[PDB]
């Protein structure tokens, strides 16, 4: 638990411009965000799942946030009204933001992206498979077996068993 010995990062290191978009603006345009920003998301989630340290790969988290900000600024430069209409139809379509309720504006958004950036929208389940990456960060350590030099010693299988000296050593026996 957090004491004075633990080295938390300073608040000036944590002062990063954040992706402050709503749920409809994150659900819409996600399939073009993931393909454009697959190099940093996989490395950051590998950092989060392998080390399980919140203080580690903070630069990777900053890279993910900056890459998402760069993609949304690129969308803001060219295709703004189409993305706004797509997010509006996605939020007003149903309770949960489901893509199947209106496909009419999704085609216009993909047409705008195909005409401007020449990007192809991926399939429906491209981002839910297993991702294989060539991470530059080395894996930390193999789980070594704990050494117990003084355990409870049993009788070994190779130990010879001569007959007992004067047998059972009971009363009147042997």
């Amino acid at each position: 638990v957090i004491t004075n010995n633990t080295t938390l990062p300073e608040e000036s290191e944590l002062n990063v411009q954040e992706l402050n978009l709503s749920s409809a603006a994150l659900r819409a345009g996600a399939f073009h965000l993931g393909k454009q920003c697959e190099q940093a998301n996989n490395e950051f989630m590998l950092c989060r799942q392998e080390l399980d340290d919140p203080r580690a790969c903070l630069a990777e988290g900053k890279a993910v946030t900056s890459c998402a900000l760069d993609f949304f600024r690129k969308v803001k430069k060219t295709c703004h009204e189409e993305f706004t209409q797509y997010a509006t139809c996605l939020d007003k379509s149903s309770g949960t933001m489901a893509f199947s309720h209106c496909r009419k504006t999704q085609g216009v958004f993909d047409k705008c992206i195909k005409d401007n950036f020449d990007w192809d929208r991926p399939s429906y389940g491209y981002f839910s498979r297993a991702k294989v990456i060539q991470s530059a960060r080395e894996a930390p350590k193999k789980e070594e077996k704990v050494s117990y030099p003084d355990a409870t010693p049993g009788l070994p299988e190779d130990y010879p068993k001569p007959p007992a000296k004067y047998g059972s050593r009971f009363h009147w026996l042997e």
Binding site: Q17, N20, L21, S22, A25, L69, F72, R73, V75, K76, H80, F83, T84, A87
Partner: peptide, 8 residues
């Protein structure tokens, strides 16, 4: 929407 994003 996209108007929240500052210009950079």
């Amino acid at each position: 929407g996209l108007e929240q994003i500052p210009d950079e």
